[PDB]
Amino acid sequence: FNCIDWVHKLTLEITDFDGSVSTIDLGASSSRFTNWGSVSLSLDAEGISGSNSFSFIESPGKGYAIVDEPFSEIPRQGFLGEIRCNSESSVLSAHESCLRAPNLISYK
Amino acid sequence: DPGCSELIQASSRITTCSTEGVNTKCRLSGTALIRAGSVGAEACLMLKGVKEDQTKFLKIKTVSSELSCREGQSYWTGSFSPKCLSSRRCHLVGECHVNRCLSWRDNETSAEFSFVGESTTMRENKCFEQCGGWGCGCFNVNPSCLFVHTYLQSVRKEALRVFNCIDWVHKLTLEITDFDGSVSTIDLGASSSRFTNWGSVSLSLDAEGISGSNSFSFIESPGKGYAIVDEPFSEIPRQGFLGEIRCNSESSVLSAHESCLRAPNLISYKPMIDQLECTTNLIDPFVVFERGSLPQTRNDKTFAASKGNRGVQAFSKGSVQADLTLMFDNFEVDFVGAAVSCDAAFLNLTGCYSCNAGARVCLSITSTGTGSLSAHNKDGSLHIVLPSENGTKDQCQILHFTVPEVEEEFMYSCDGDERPLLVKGTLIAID
Amino acid sequence: TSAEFSFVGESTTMRENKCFEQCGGWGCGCFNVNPSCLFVHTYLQSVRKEALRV
Amino acid sequence: EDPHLRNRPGKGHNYIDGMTQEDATCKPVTYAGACSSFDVLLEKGKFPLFQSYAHHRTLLEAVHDTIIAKADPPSCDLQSAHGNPCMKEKLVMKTHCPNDYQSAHYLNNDGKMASVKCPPKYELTEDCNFCRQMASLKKGSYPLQDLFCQSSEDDGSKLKTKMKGVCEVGVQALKKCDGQLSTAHEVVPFAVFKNSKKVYLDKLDLKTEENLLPDSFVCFEHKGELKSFDISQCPKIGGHGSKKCTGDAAFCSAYECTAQYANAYCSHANGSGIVQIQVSGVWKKPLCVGYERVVVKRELS
Amino acid sequence: EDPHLRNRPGKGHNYIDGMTQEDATCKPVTYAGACSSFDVLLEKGKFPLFQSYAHHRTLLEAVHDTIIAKADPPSCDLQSAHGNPCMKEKLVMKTHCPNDYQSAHYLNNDGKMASVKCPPKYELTEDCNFCRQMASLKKGSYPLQDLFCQSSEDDGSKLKTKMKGVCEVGVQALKKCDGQLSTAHEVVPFAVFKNSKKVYLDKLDLKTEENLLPDSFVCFEHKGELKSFDISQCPKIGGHGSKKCTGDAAFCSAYECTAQYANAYCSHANGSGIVQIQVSGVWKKPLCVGYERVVVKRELS
């Protein structure tokens, strides 16, 4: 995946009046419905620009990564992302919904 | 304050008279010309019948010099909030297909959301694939489906309309008074015409305007003050821009009508198998409405709102030089010769000489019957018209002079016999 | 020609038909939440008593 | 749509004098009624004003509303000699009258119901001015003026015709002209208040101001076609009136619903309100305003 | 179409005191015997929620299964007006009966069964509210709500209305309001927990776990009346059990099928089993969830 605008996220652990503990988060101007109502941000600052020329890799239960190249738009030969899908099950089971590069599988 | 400043006599070619019921009535089937008065002055029109006592006047009271606007492309906007529903279905259940879920249309109600009801709002139908198997709560090994039905609603009790200006039309709010005494308040801008009981009127000469109005967008608030934004008009509504969701009417925003224009792929989603928190990072126009609230100081002008009639104006500090066209649609002007007596007395005379505002004059008119007063000087360039009734009142108007030592003899009457009257007063020099 | 002003007729006078969206419900003077209509029948009239050939 | 085309609120009586051949087919006026003095009022391509303002009152309904008195005589005779009251106001008309008709009613200058009638068995001509020999003949009259009435009470005895620069319109003697008379048949509206004269106009400006009024509700009997039921027979909530009433949530919230004790189901309607008129700049409540096609004389010079 | 949805699990009783003399055919609900209190729930284009969840219990079936209690009185008497137990809970509700009915049931604020009643020989109006005078006389009750009921044991009687921003919705007065309100008939859902009240719903987020539970299937007696059959007695794949079972590929792909040598026939149902819902951010298992068109008074000014 890629990033177009870094959103300043603040993880909030809201504790109600009775004693119930709830851990949530807020970003930019999003609002989440809680037990007593809803909370949202009002003012944000400190933004990082120029993130369209980078691509990140997410791993299930392992970690993240950073790649110093623009994000893959169209799949083609000789570039990262020759066979792309939509979900993890589409990769582990090879479903027809995946998008591959035309004339990628060679033959002899 | 009343008072004739610029007075002119109508031409005899467009002035014809008749006689019906021991009365000499006259109609006008033409158009005259008179200079537009400044702040407080008037542009009276002397109407002569067949002799001297039968003289009528049409007062046009000028409020102040204003600059109206010309709305072209406008739209309504406001705050909104998403409200989406979640419904997870396992594979091989109804219409659970990843090929159909991937290319799922927004204007197609799914089989799991056809029981919502009458929702005439900006609704959409999305879909996202999740997990499956026995670990997620399904019988088939294939992943499950998650139909999404998102519809917008209105959460703010007020809305705002964003418009622009292409040419500051110099509007002059005129209070035209008919010959009989009917008072009518109208407005004229540049070369616009209205509709009055005596025909029609339109502004002629106009040499006042403000350039560079396209690069400024205004915001109208129902009831409260307006606003001003220092940016050009909003083009196409896209993500991360002021005015990404627009409509056409106020009810389309206060009730979230489906006939509105919004940014595509704006409503975010959080696929969490079962849960789905949908939030939208909408732009709040109230921040700009509070940072740029009228009145403000822009260059050497004063931008503010307008009373009574909704619209934005622009206060100026220049002179008032314009012309008026009094179009008469063949309207008769009757006049009954009164026979009541009056004994007027001079009071004071304060104001200015050779000024556009004129000098204020007051008299002590004391009559015994309800009628009108008609006065004139000696050479024929000054006239005094003031109401009269049974009792003792003090009527005041504005008269123009070109000398600080006013020593002009007046000839006022209330039935026929004219008596002399002398006025005096010290004036000041006002440019 | 709108039905609210079809009694005037299809004469040879410069005419036009406009319509603007308003408001409905009991807050404005209707019964339904749908906005009302505003049928406009604009026709021009000769103001000056004479013409000029430029 | 428009479910209020034939339903007449309040009275709803279209009785004409002289042409007494429809007394049992016009009182009242229901959905399935067969009244000759109301069928042509909703004809496509005839009276668009009545089609636009259908939920109002007509001329005869205003006469039977105890607010407009009839003329004397109410049914004029076109076969008279000299001195016919219904001749100067009838010959100057321009509205074409259809065939298969014998009577024709209109409004005079005084504000009374005036009508003409041919002797049996004659009918009207093309200009419906004389009487010539005889589908089937109608059992009533024909509306000559496209006007709508309502419930008003403002006085208009001090307001006269405001047609400026007009010589003589219709039959009224306005002012004296100095140029050559220009005879031209045009459409000039007319406004008649409560007990006033026929005041003509030039630019008719009509606005509608609707609110919580009892005239915005219709009713109809049950059916195990439709009928008619007056809305004035429904009292308020927590009380008892003359006749029983019932309705839906839009009717039971304002008036008391007697459940099955009533014999007519009421629904929600909208089309009444308080219609105003622009006369001399002041917005007043008109009584019977409409349009009339008469001879208009103007100045050529 | 094939009336396969008439097989109701458990008891399948649809009868109430007062009227409805068709209890000889509506007890139970099978193929034979026309039941007017269930045939209207199978026609497409009316109540799609009950058609999607046509494998659980209804309201009356929940009453006859020790789930929903009976109100006092269970049938409102519409003979005496000016006050009755069925006024506020029905006047705000917007429904539509296909006529020829007299009885209609709905849900009250307490959580019991509140129904109207028209004494013979009356009829319901087009809005199912009050009665009216007089085809056939259908004494059965008309389902006024598109609700579905099931069995659960999750406690949750400490939650009220979750809607925020509405002054008075339906019959519950959350807060007092005297200004202008947005009075409009909206479709707002509702839910009833274990021995709770009419808990209104702001959003509907269901959750059904399709597993091997008896509530997730509609096993009935194999043919070649019909009640609910416990699926736990069906033998597993590659093993041995008590009785015999059979079904389609969805059932034969998990258990053992013997075709004609089976005492019961099973089939995979659409939308059946443990049904959860979101409330206060915590998943709970309700009892009866449905929709209703009541008057919602939202805030404005």
Numbering used by the authors:
A (entry chain T): 850 to 957
B (entry chain R): 688 to 1118
C (entry chain P): 796 to 849
D (entry chain O), E (entry chain Q): 154 to 287, 290 to 379, 393 to 469
Can you provide the manuscript's text about this entry?
Rift Valley fever virus (RVFV; genus phlebovirus, family Phenuiviridae) is an important example of an enveloped virus that harbours a class II fusion protein. As with other phleboviruses, RVFV displays two glycoproteins on the lipid bilayer envelope of the virion, Gn and Gc, which form higher order pentameric and hexameric ring-shaped assemblies. While the Gc glycoprotein is responsible for membrane fusion, the role of the Gn remains undefined. Virus entry is completed upon Gc-mediated fusion of the viral envelope and host cell membrane, in a pH-dependent mechanism.
Single-particle averaging and 3D reconstruction yielded a 13-Å resolution reconstruction of the Gn–Gc spike envelope. The resolution of the reconstruction was most likely limited to 13-Å due to remaining flexibility of the particles, despite efforts to include in the reconstruction only the most ordered particles by manual selection and 3D classification. The resolution was further improved by application of our localized reconstruction method, which accounted for the flexibility remaining in the fixed RVFV virions. We first performed fitting with the localized reconstruction of the pentamer at 7.7 Å resolution, followed by fitting the resulting Gn–Gc heterodimer model to localized reconstructions of the hexamers at 8.0–8.6 Å resolution. This sequential fitting approach allowed us to create a full atomic description of the Gn–Gc glycoprotein shell by applying icosahedral symmetry to the 12 Gn–Gc dimers in the asymmetric unit. Indeed, the improved resolution of the density maps for the capsomers reported here (7.7–8.6 Å), combined with high-resolution crystal structures, allowed the construction of an accurate atomic model of the whole virion surface. Consistent with previous biochemical and structural studies, this fitting verified that the Gn and Gc assemble as heterodimers, which form higher order ring-like pentameric and hexameric capsomer structures on the mature virion. Domain A of the Gn forms a ring on top of these capsomers interacting with domain II of Gc, occluding a surface area of ~950 Å2. The Gn–Gc interface is formed between the β-ribbon domain of the Gn and the hydrophobic fusion loops of Gc11, which are shielded from solvent at the interface between Gn domains A and B. Surprisingly, unlike the rod-like array of extended anti-parallel Gc dimers predicted from the low-resolution modelling attempts, we observed that RVFV Gc forms a kinked conformation, not previously sampled in crystallographic investigations of class II fusion glycoproteins. In toto, our integrative structural biology approach reveals the shielding of the Gc fusion loop in the pre-fusion state by its partner protein Gn.
